[PDB]
Amino acid sequence: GSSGSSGPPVIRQGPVNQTVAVDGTFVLSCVATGSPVPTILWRKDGVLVSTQDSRIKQLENGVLQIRYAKLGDTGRYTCIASTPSGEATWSAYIEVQEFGVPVQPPRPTDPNLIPSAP
């Protein structure tokens, strides 16, 4: 079959806690060994990342980029490496702070009461 193998996955370097401004851009890279190459995944608040919004895109292998970091994005990102020899993860937190943005109050919504005749 396979004579000799790299071994268990080991994250030599990954994402580190960094501060970013609102509507900014925070990048995260996850490095891990293992043959075949380990699969770098992403999870937000213990949930599978939503790689559907233009905001989140994958430029390279394991390299993810999230543009337009909103205040609601303030979460803890974690990397996951799956391999036929083992699996490892990493810790990383991202904070979003508003700066240079004007007051953005809520939208004027009504209780859906009865309409005004006159």
UniProtKB/Swiss-Prot annotation:
Ubiquitinated. May be deubiquitinated by USP33. Changing residue 118 to S: In CPHD8; uncertain significance. It is found in: Cell membrane; Cell projection, Axon; Endoplasmic reticulum-Golgi intermediate compartment membrane. Disulfide bonds join 30-79. Glycans are attached at residue 17. Widely expressed, with exception of kidney. Coiled coil: none annotated. Residues 9-95 form the Ig-like C2-type domain. Belongs to the immunoglobulin superfamily. ROBO family. Homodimer. Dimerization is mediated by the extracellular domain and is independent of SLIT liganding. Interacts with SLIT1. Interacts with SLIT2. Interacts with FLRT3. Interacts with MYO9B (via Rho-GAP domain). Maps within a region of overlapping homozygous deletions characterized in both small cell lung cancer cell lines (SCLC) and in a breast cancer cell line. The promoter region of ROBO1 shows complete hypermethylation of CpG sites in the BT-20 breast tumor cell lines, some primary invasive breast carcinomasa and some primary clear cell renal cell carcinomas (CC-RCC). Receptor for SLIT1 and SLIT2 that mediates cellular responses to molecular guidance cues in cellular migration, including axonal navigation at the ventral midline of the neural tube and projection of axons to different regions during neuronal development. Interaction with the intracellular domain of FLRT3 mediates axon attraction towards cells expressing NTN1. In axon growth cones, the silencing of the attractive effect of NTN1 by SLIT2 may require the formation of a ROBO1-DCC complex. It is linked to Neurooculorenal syndrome: An autosomal recessive syndrome characterized by variable clinical features including congenital renal anomalies, neurodevelopmental defects, intellectual impairment, cardiac defects, and ocular anomalies. Some affected individuals present in utero with renal agenesis and structural brain abnormalities incompatible with life. Nystagmus 8, congenital, autosomal recessive: A form of nystagmus, a condition defined as conjugated, spontaneous and involuntary ocular oscillations that appear at birth or during the first three months of life. Other associated features may include mildly decreased visual acuity, strabismus, astigmatism, and occasionally head nodding. NYS8 patients manifest bilateral horizontal nystagmus in the absence of other neurologic signs or symptoms. Brain imaging is normal. This is Roundabout homolog 1. It comes from Homo sapiens. The lineage of its organism: Eukaryota, Metazoa, Chordata, Craniata, Vertebrata. The gene is ROBO1.
